[PDB]
């Protein structure tokens, strides 16, 4: 597994429907 928070890419996160990179904060 992986620790958190963590910064990675995702399609529909931190206000990014398309696909952006953000941290779990």
Curated annotation (Swiss-Prot):
Transmembrane segments: none annotated. Disulfide bonds join 7-23, 10-13, 11-19, 14-22. It comes from the Eukaryota. This is Hepcidin-25. The gene is HAMP. The chain holds residues 60 to 84 of 84 of the full protein.
């Amino acid at each position: 597994d992986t620790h958190f928070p963590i910064c990675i890419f995702c399609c529909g996160c931190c206000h990014r429907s398309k696909c952006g990179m953000c941290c779990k904060t």
